[PDB]
Amino acid sequence: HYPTDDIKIKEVKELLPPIAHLYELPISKEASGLVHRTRQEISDLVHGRDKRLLVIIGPCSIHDPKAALEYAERLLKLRKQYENELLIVMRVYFAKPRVGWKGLINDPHLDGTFDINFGLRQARSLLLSLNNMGMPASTEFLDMITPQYYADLISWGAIGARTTESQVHRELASGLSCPVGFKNGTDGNLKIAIDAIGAASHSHHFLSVTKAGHSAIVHTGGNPDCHVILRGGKEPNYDAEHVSEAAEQLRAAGVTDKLMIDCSHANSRKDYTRQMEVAQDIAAQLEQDGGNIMGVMVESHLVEGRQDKPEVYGKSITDACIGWGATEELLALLAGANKKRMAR
Amino acid sequence: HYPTDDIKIKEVKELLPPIAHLYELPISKEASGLVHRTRQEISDLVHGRDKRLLVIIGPCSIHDPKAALEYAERLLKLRKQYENELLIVMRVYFAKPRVGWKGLINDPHLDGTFDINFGLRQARSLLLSLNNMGMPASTEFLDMITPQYYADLISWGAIGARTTESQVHRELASGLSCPVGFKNGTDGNLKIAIDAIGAASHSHHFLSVTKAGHSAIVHTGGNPDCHVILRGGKEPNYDAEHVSEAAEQLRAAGVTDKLMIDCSHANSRKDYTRQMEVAQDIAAQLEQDGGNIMGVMVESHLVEGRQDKPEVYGKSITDACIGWGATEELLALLAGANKKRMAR
Amino acid sequence: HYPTDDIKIKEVKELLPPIAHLYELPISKEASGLVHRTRQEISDLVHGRDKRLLVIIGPCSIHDPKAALEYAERLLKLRKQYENELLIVMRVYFAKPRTVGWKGLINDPHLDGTFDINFGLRQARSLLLSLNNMGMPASTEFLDMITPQYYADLISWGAIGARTTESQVHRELASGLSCPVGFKNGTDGNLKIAIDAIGAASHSHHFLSVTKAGHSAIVHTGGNPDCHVILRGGKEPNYDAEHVSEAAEQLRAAGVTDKLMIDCSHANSRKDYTRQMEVAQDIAAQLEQDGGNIMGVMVESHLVEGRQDKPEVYGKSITDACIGWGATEELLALLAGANKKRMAR
Amino acid sequence: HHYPTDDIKIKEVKELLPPIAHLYELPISKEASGLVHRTRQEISDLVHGRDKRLLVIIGPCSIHDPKAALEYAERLLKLRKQYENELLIVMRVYFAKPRVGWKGLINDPHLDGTFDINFGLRQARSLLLSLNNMGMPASTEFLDMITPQYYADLISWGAIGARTTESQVHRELASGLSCPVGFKNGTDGNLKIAIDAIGAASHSHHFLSVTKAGHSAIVHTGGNPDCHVILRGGKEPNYDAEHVSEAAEQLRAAGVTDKLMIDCSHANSRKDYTRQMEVAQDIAAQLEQDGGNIMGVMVESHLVEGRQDKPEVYGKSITDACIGWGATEELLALLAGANKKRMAR
Ligand SMILES: N[C@@H](Cc1ccccc1)C(=O)O
Ligand SMILES: N[C@@H](Cc1ccccc1)C(=O)O
Ligand SMILES: N[C@@H](Cc1ccccc1)C(=O)O
Ligand SMILES: N[C@@H](Cc1ccccc1)C(=O)O
Ligand SMILES: [Mn+2]
Ligand SMILES: [Mn+2]
Ligand SMILES: [Mn+2]
Ligand SMILES: [Mn+2]
């Protein structure tokens, strides 16, 4: 026999099964309540039963648990203060969808050693600490296996621009315990996200692993808590005209016309200093009408900007983020605007 | 103590591991020769060493292995006849990337019962029978787990238009033993596929299973045999102007400027009779110059058109296909056109 | 670091999990029915509910499935012929507990030294399924804690041999086996170890094995109330009335069942397959006199008598020596006659 | 539906955390690796006659409490260092006796019948890594074919007990253990099973178990050349000079090492801990006269003497009765005394 199997494979190493991580780090009664409740609260937002604004906000990527926990500590205070106008959940994303650093799960030690057992442990550990302190977590799931390791700790999931059209990621979302947001495509196709909600609301089958770590078929029940995310395209799509047009196509498709607006990425034009602009336009809509907005997303860290090496504490090494002060302003701006909308 | 795990899952059933299927249906020496050889031949096309045309052709999707075998039986004689001008490899795709029928792996019995162990068995059996008879096989990998069950029998793989931009599908491609084609986006975005080749040529790490069925981290070494597939979008992109523009961009990104043209899907605009037209243009191109074309894709079946239910034998239940007579003319057209290119 | 792990291991290779084999060879309706029934029928003998004699009879070891099947076709006739007097169940043991040479049909199914265990295990399940489907139940020895997951669903009666009867894990195993189990006395004739094994196996225990899916697992057992002793001699033969009587006394004293099995082969025969008949005559004389403590016998039998080092002749053992088919007819006819009279009392 | 045939007598089969999960949480350290590699080699030297120190396997009958066990180890480690030129001291870290009652530390770590085996295996590995880290090698008995994948990398010396020495699979296991292995004589004093065991264990075999990832597996061994017998009595003790001589003669006749270990406890003490000293005194007299064929002894010792049905008292056995710490010092001072003189010849 000529060889035909694993020709271009350096190594296939066994990973500790999810059950191993769940044994060391069982979810606590407290994290369980914060998760269950935040998910329900978000459901109400998706389906129009509450007019609070869901704010997904935090670092572009997590590369340092200390800074992440310190960021949460400061955010927790504002989560409480604006709890009547805003439902603040923290971005706990472990990589960018990219060339550069491959994320915290792949490369937890920031040196190129790919210790993914440790990476996954750290991600779970972080997510339980956060929930335990009272800060819910959100994340993007890039693949169909990692969710088994910590989705139990996640109160809101994203499927990014580059995966919203992928069948298997829609099948994933259809079984995720948390509400899920589908982003529009990298060039501004909103339809792919609309179809994804359709798909995600039905029952599907996809492949993954059991909690015990073995190949498996997953039969989902459908996810009725999905929604669109406006993150821009060739041009930005945050304004009232783009919101109104999205809302119409949503209704026509017979899915929720309540949606979320990313202030960052292509809606800012990859310029962190324009997130405030977007949030200001969103504030104007809320004060006017803004019936179709249920959430915003905001890339934010202790220190503003980007760096290639993790030199500065609390500075992103993936996309550029606004800093803490700009975070106080933006959140305040949104809370006040939405106080007025809810008051009508 | 609120539940948070698997809230929207009906069932997670463990699957027979790949080793089980590999025990019942080990790759034979002759299939192993055919695959090894065929990957290498295709790799020569991708890199400009051989001017024969790769022809990926066959059903939109396999819904009946018996008819698929009979198809292959007719195709093989054409493979042999045109072996100096065309390298003919059969489409063995088990699903459309969507609605309705979930494909042969999910739903092998065509009634709705989701017998996945059986479907995986049937897919491997069909692929081994095809190789053993001397017909190489091609397919699309939609997830990161199914390759372990039968990628060893695959001479060419596709990442489809809906997944080319997906990070995890790029990582997968980087570790596939076969050469891989990346389709352009559903709206015509060629860049996502050019970036995909760049991405897939490097080492990555993604999650999957071992042959024994255990969750695994897999370290790839890069796939140097990737290329682009022009597939249409808002308008078709098969003509010389589009081919020439794409070649420049490929050169600019420093990747192979030899590409593949799908005669079906958004180039035929879902009209199966127009695939013959696309081939005509392609043939006229090759006759003038056609330096940048290394293959084409055709959707072809025993009988033409499509049907919703599998009533008629060898007739598609997914995208409509040209029938056997049109397939003969198309392949003769392409053989003759490329005979003249090669003779220059 | 210095190394400390796997220092004396040439390789550890993965095996197909039990489910892969149970997928290919699912137990049939009629195989299920035969297994259940037979286990129940044997239980009744263990516990004095029925006076039929269990006869565990067949090759010392299976080295050729085709031979095994032809053997089963002939025995089947007699199983049916003598169904009112004898419960005939075939021996399907895949190795002798050795000590250098052929390591059995599971380990070495090709009989050339390759160790294709995936294949052996499939072949063994395949044979046990075909035997049951034809109306012949099967018996075997389980040497380890993992093999029973592959084919115990096809076994109507199992043995724990002389060399493992005292082993704590083998007793815990037996406590979780679905079939009734016979515990052999020690190689030097020690009966107490088998008496203790009955009491031990009746309780609930825990041991390590694999799930059907092939992963490390803890097995919490329910207890096996259908165990009994097997007299197989040792320093001296223990098939006669006097030995049977001393054993029954010790068994009653421990509060376990005083119904036992007698091996006519191995050390009771002194490794001479022609003495198997003599032992059966003795057992038959006992059954005629009284023999109330006997529920079964064991007999090593094959198409062709004797043994051989290489598998040259069809139907002849390459492990212990067996009586041939003619002698089998005598033996079974003899025991059926002696027990017919017992059951008439 | 079919008649049922599968797991009729099973309460449950719960899947287990795989060895890799414990190996991740508790990886062997560089210093523990050195001690294990070095101690294994030193013991091999003792087995093959290259060093004349006495291997002393000493410690509790069974470990029911790691705190007590760690304290016992700190005390023993002093005498390990003190007597290093005369005795090779290694701690007994047995997790159960091969038995109904308490099922051991691995099976039932919480001593209350809850059977939390993931925790038990976690605890056993932890204690063993802590012992090697403080500088005290560890010995244990392997009762099955699976547990070793969880912590054998931390064992410097292995026992196969009296009740398993004759078992085919246990001998096959032994042939793949990274550590040296002592085989005990049978519960009735049969020495031959142990001598056969050494022979068997020195060759390559194939037995079934699990990969480190927990998957059903076939294990191919390279043989264990470092095996020896352990004399632990029978119907009568077998520690004296005469029994030692006759054993050495049979060992030589079989072509295997005539160097042996004497267990001072169990059937050599007549199951009476007060007699372990008697046995140790005789062995000492032998070492002073000649004692050439003795390479080790086994002593059942704990912080406090005797035993108890329930774990009320700290550092007192709940399995076999042990000598207390005072006696332990007395016994070790004696052996070091006797062997200093033997080594000086
Ligand atoms: N555990 C995930 C669902 C899931 C199951 C299996 C595979 C992947 C995802 C959740 O609760 O959301
Ligand atoms: N076995 C695949 C590569 C692969 C390994 C593991 C997971 C996914 C893909 C091949 O030969 O192409
Ligand atoms: N499946 C075996 C019992 C068993 C379970 C698990 C391990 C070993 C044996 C039977 O039914 O007899
Ligand atoms: N890991 C054991 C050997 C072993 C392997 C596999 C199963 C059982 C035992 C050792 O180092 O000694
Ligand atoms: Mn970002
Ligand atoms: Mn198609
Ligand atoms: Mn025999
Ligand atoms: Mn003891």
PDB file of N, CA, C and O in Angstrom, chain B residues 58-61 91 93 95-98 101 162 183 262 264-266 268 270-272 275 299-301 303-307 315-322:
ATOM      1  N   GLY B  58     -19.851  14.729 -12.177  1.00  0.00           N
ATOM      2  CA  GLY B  58     -20.718  13.742 -11.597  1.00  0.00           C
ATOM      3  C   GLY B  58     -21.920  14.424 -10.982  1.00  0.00           C
ATOM      4  O   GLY B  58     -22.115  15.630 -11.158  1.00  0.00           O
ATOM      5  N   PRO B  59     -22.726  13.665 -10.254  1.00  0.00           N
ATOM      6  CA  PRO B  59     -23.934  14.158  -9.636  1.00  0.00           C
ATOM      7  C   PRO B  59     -23.730  15.306  -8.652  1.00  0.00           C
ATOM      8  O   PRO B  59     -22.715  15.388  -7.951  1.00  0.00           O
ATOM      9  N   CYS B  60     -24.719  16.171  -8.583  1.00  0.00           N
ATOM     10  CA  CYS B  60     -24.713  17.182  -7.574  1.00  0.00           C
ATOM     11  C   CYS B  60     -24.504  16.519  -6.246  1.00  0.00           C
ATOM     12  O   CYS B  60     -23.785  17.034  -5.406  1.00  0.00           O
ATOM     13  N   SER B  61     -25.154  15.377  -6.063  1.00  0.00           N
ATOM     14  CA  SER B  61     -25.096  14.638  -4.824  1.00  0.00           C
ATOM     15  C   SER B  61     -25.481  13.178  -5.055  1.00  0.00           C
ATOM     16  O   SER B  61     -26.331  12.847  -5.886  1.00  0.00           O
ATOM     17  N   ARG B  91     -17.428  13.377  -9.180  1.00  0.00           N
ATOM     18  CA  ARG B  91     -18.060  14.030  -8.038  1.00  0.00           C
ATOM     19  C   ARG B  91     -18.712  12.989  -7.148  1.00  0.00           C
ATOM     20  O   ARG B  91     -19.616  12.306  -7.594  1.00  0.00           O
ATOM     21  N   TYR B  93     -20.207  13.725  -3.807  1.00  0.00           N
ATOM     22  CA  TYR B  93     -20.642  14.641  -2.781  1.00  0.00           C
ATOM     23  C   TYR B  93     -21.886  14.062  -2.151  1.00  0.00           C
ATOM     24  O   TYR B  93     -22.829  13.729  -2.848  1.00  0.00           O
ATOM     25  N   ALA B  95     -23.991  15.562   0.231  1.00  0.00           N
ATOM     26  CA  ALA B  95     -25.067  16.543   0.506  1.00  0.00           C
ATOM     27  C   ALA B  95     -24.906  17.880  -0.255  1.00  0.00           C
ATOM     28  O   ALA B  95     -23.805  18.248  -0.676  1.00  0.00           O
ATOM     29  N   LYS B  96     -26.006  18.597  -0.452  1.00  0.00           N
ATOM     30  CA  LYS B  96     -25.905  20.007  -0.813  1.00  0.00           C
ATOM     31  C   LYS B  96     -25.607  20.736   0.502  1.00  0.00           C
ATOM     32  O   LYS B  96     -26.094  20.325   1.548  1.00  0.00           O
ATOM     33  N   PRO B  97     -24.762  21.776   0.482  1.00  0.00           N
ATOM     34  CA  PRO B  97     -24.781  22.662   1.661  1.00  0.00           C
ATOM     35  C   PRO B  97     -26.040  23.578   1.634  1.00  0.00           C
ATOM     36  O   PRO B  97     -25.979  24.719   1.149  1.00  0.00           O
ATOM     37  N   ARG B  98     -27.155  23.053   2.165  1.00  0.00           N
ATOM     38  CA  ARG B  98     -28.538  23.574   1.987  1.00  0.00           C
ATOM     39  C   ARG B  98     -28.701  24.783   1.042  1.00  0.00           C
ATOM     40  O   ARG B  98     -28.212  25.887   1.317  1.00  0.00           O
ATOM     41  N   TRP B 101     -33.841  17.458   2.192  1.00  0.00           N
ATOM     42  CA  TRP B 101     -33.077  16.212   2.412  1.00  0.00           C
ATOM     43  C   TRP B 101     -31.657  16.528   2.915  1.00  0.00           C
ATOM     44  O   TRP B 101     -30.928  17.332   2.327  1.00  0.00           O
ATOM     45  N   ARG B 162     -19.758  28.681   0.651  1.00  0.00           N
ATOM     46  CA  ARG B 162     -20.263  29.069   1.976  1.00  0.00           C
ATOM     47  C   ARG B 162     -19.310  28.835   3.138  1.00  0.00           C
ATOM     48  O   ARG B 162     -19.643  29.181   4.252  1.00  0.00           O
ATOM     49  N   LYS B 183     -13.850  27.455  -3.407  1.00  0.00           N
ATOM     50  CA  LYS B 183     -14.764  28.282  -4.197  1.00  0.00           C
ATOM     51  C   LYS B 183     -14.817  29.751  -3.785  1.00  0.00           C
ATOM     52  O   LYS B 183     -14.582  30.108  -2.623  1.00  0.00           O
ATOM     53  N   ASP B 262     -16.221  26.255 -12.438  1.00  0.00           N
ATOM     54  CA  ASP B 262     -17.416  25.460 -12.255  1.00  0.00           C
ATOM     55  C   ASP B 262     -18.344  25.909 -13.379  1.00  0.00           C
ATOM     56  O   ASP B 262     -18.616  27.113 -13.532  1.00  0.00           O
ATOM     57  N   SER B 264     -21.393  24.902 -13.530  1.00  0.00           N
ATOM     58  CA  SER B 264     -22.734  24.848 -12.948  1.00  0.00           C
ATOM     59  C   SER B 264     -22.916  25.940 -11.920  1.00  0.00           C
ATOM     60  O   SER B 264     -22.291  27.004 -11.997  1.00  0.00           O
ATOM     61  N   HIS B 265     -23.812  25.679 -10.970  1.00  0.00           N
ATOM     62  CA  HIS B 265     -24.137  26.621  -9.920  1.00  0.00           C
ATOM     63  C   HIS B 265     -24.374  28.077 -10.426  1.00  0.00           C
ATOM     64  O   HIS B 265     -25.278  28.273 -11.263  1.00  0.00           O
ATOM     65  N   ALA B 266     -23.643  29.076  -9.926  1.00  0.00           N
ATOM     66  CA  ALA B 266     -23.916  30.478 -10.282  1.00  0.00           C
ATOM     67  C   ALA B 266     -23.276  30.916 -11.631  1.00  0.00           C
ATOM     68  O   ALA B 266     -23.526  32.026 -12.100  1.00  0.00           O
ATOM     69  N   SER B 268     -23.766  28.793 -14.407  1.00  0.00           N
ATOM     70  CA  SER B 268     -24.911  28.370 -15.244  1.00  0.00           C
ATOM     71  C   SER B 268     -26.192  29.037 -14.774  1.00  0.00           C
ATOM     72  O   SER B 268     -27.233  28.877 -15.373  1.00  0.00           O
ATOM     73  N   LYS B 270     -27.975  28.091 -12.314  1.00  0.00           N
ATOM     74  CA  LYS B 270     -28.904  27.033 -11.927  1.00  0.00           C
ATOM     75  C   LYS B 270     -29.756  26.532 -13.100  1.00  0.00           C
ATOM     76  O   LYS B 270     -30.786  25.879 -12.888  1.00  0.00           O
ATOM     77  N   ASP B 271     -29.309  26.823 -14.328  1.00  0.00           N
ATOM     78  CA  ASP B 271     -29.921  26.259 -15.540  1.00  0.00           C
ATOM     79  C   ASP B 271     -28.994  25.232 -16.124  1.00  0.00           C
ATOM     80  O   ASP B 271     -27.973  25.580 -16.731  1.00  0.00           O
ATOM     81  N   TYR B 272     -29.354  23.969 -15.993  1.00  0.00           N
ATOM     82  CA  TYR B 272     -28.397  22.909 -16.301  1.00  0.00           C
ATOM     83  C   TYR B 272     -27.982  22.931 -17.783  1.00  0.00           C
ATOM     84  O   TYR B 272     -26.843  22.593 -18.092  1.00  0.00           O
ATOM     85  N   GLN B 275     -24.665  24.814 -18.706  1.00  0.00           N
ATOM     86  CA  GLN B 275     -23.332  24.301 -18.409  1.00  0.00           C
ATOM     87  C   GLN B 275     -22.602  24.054 -19.726  1.00  0.00           C
ATOM     88  O   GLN B 275     -21.408  24.330 -19.838  1.00  0.00           O
ATOM     89  N   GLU B 299     -21.864  19.394 -13.310  1.00  0.00           N
ATOM     90  CA  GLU B 299     -22.838  18.589 -12.606  1.00  0.00           C
ATOM     91  C   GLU B 299     -23.582  17.702 -13.628  1.00  0.00           C
ATOM     92  O   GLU B 299     -24.300  18.203 -14.476  1.00  0.00           O
ATOM     93  N   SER B 300     -23.380  16.382 -13.531  1.00  0.00           N
ATOM     94  CA  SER B 300     -23.790  15.428 -14.560  1.00  0.00           C
ATOM     95  C   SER B 300     -24.296  14.133 -13.961  1.00  0.00           C
ATOM     96  O   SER B 300     -23.731  13.618 -13.005  1.00  0.00           O
ATOM     97  N   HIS B 301     -25.330  13.590 -14.572  1.00  0.00           N
ATOM     98  CA  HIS B 301     -26.002  12.387 -14.118  1.00  0.00           C
ATOM     99  C   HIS B 301     -26.462  11.517 -15.292  1.00  0.00           C
ATOM    100  O   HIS B 301     -26.308  11.905 -16.424  1.00  0.00           O
ATOM    101  N   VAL B 303     -29.392  10.633 -16.151  1.00  0.00           N
ATOM    102  CA  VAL B 303     -30.556  11.287 -16.724  1.00  0.00           C
ATOM    103  C   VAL B 303     -30.534  12.745 -16.284  1.00  0.00           C
ATOM    104  O   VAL B 303     -30.175  13.066 -15.158  1.00  0.00           O
ATOM    105  N   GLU B 304     -30.980  13.611 -17.173  1.00  0.00           N
ATOM    106  CA  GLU B 304     -30.924  15.037 -16.960  1.00  0.00           C
ATOM    107  C   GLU B 304     -32.014  15.564 -15.987  1.00  0.00           C
ATOM    108  O   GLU B 304     -32.991  14.850 -15.650  1.00  0.00           O
ATOM    109  N   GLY B 305     -31.828  16.817 -15.560  1.00  0.00           N
ATOM    110  CA  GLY B 305     -32.831  17.550 -14.788  1.00  0.00           C
ATOM    111  C   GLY B 305     -32.756  17.210 -13.320  1.00  0.00           C
ATOM    112  O   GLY B 305     -31.684  16.803 -12.813  1.00  0.00           O
ATOM    113  N   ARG B 306     -33.892  17.364 -12.635  1.00  0.00           N
ATOM    114  CA  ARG B 306     -33.985  17.050 -11.198  1.00  0.00           C
ATOM    115  C   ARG B 306     -35.392  16.643 -10.828  1.00  0.00           C
ATOM    116  O   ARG B 306     -36.319  16.903 -11.564  1.00  0.00           O
ATOM    117  N   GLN B 307     -35.553  16.065  -9.651  1.00  0.00           N
ATOM    118  CA  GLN B 307     -36.869  15.653  -9.150  1.00  0.00           C
ATOM    119  C   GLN B 307     -36.844  15.806  -7.648  1.00  0.00           C
ATOM    120  O   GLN B 307     -35.770  15.716  -7.064  1.00  0.00           O
ATOM    121  N   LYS B 315     -31.389  10.176 -11.513  1.00  0.00           N
ATOM    122  CA  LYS B 315     -31.833  11.540 -11.717  1.00  0.00           C
ATOM    123  C   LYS B 315     -31.701  12.278 -10.384  1.00  0.00           C
ATOM    124  O   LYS B 315     -32.066  11.750  -9.327  1.00  0.00           O
ATOM    125  N   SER B 316     -31.155  13.490 -10.444  1.00  0.00           N
ATOM    126  CA  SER B 316     -30.801  14.247  -9.240  1.00  0.00           C
ATOM    127  C   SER B 316     -31.995  14.636  -8.341  1.00  0.00           C
ATOM    128  O   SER B 316     -33.071  14.927  -8.842  1.00  0.00           O
ATOM    129  N   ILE B 317     -31.804  14.655  -7.024  1.00  0.00           N
ATOM    130  CA  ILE B 317     -32.826  15.209  -6.112  1.00  0.00           C
ATOM    131  C   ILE B 317     -32.366  16.505  -5.448  1.00  0.00           C
ATOM    132  O   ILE B 317     -33.043  17.071  -4.582  1.00  0.00           O
ATOM    133  N   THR B 318     -31.187  16.970  -5.842  1.00  0.00           N
ATOM    134  CA  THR B 318     -30.673  18.254  -5.408  1.00  0.00           C
ATOM    135  C   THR B 318     -30.559  19.059  -6.702  1.00  0.00           C
ATOM    136  O   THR B 318     -31.554  19.113  -7.434  1.00  0.00           O
ATOM    137  N   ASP B 319     -29.404  19.654  -7.034  1.00  0.00           N
ATOM    138  CA  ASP B 319     -29.352  20.528  -8.232  1.00  0.00           C
ATOM    139  C   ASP B 319     -29.534  19.750  -9.535  1.00  0.00           C
ATOM    140  O   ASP B 319     -29.125  18.580  -9.658  1.00  0.00           O
ATOM    141  N   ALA B 320     -30.148  20.395 -10.525  1.00  0.00           N
ATOM    142  CA  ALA B 320     -30.383  19.732 -11.807  1.00  0.00           C
ATOM    143  C   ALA B 320     -29.066  19.527 -12.522  1.00  0.00           C
ATOM    144  O   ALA B 320     -28.159  20.339 -12.380  1.00  0.00           O
ATOM    145  N   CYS B 321     -28.960  18.429 -13.263  1.00  0.00           N
ATOM    146  CA  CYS B 321     -27.727  18.049 -13.931  1.00  0.00           C
ATOM    147  C   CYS B 321     -27.986  17.791 -15.403  1.00  0.00           C
ATOM    148  O   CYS B 321     -29.093  17.389 -15.798  1.00  0.00           O
ATOM    149  N   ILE B 322     -26.962  17.992 -16.218  1.00  0.00           N
ATOM    150  CA  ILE B 322     -27.016  17.478 -17.567  1.00  0.00           C
ATOM    151  C   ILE B 322     -27.055  15.954 -17.518  1.00  0.00           C
ATOM    152  O   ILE B 322     -26.458  15.359 -16.626  1.00  0.00           O
TER     153      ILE B 322
END
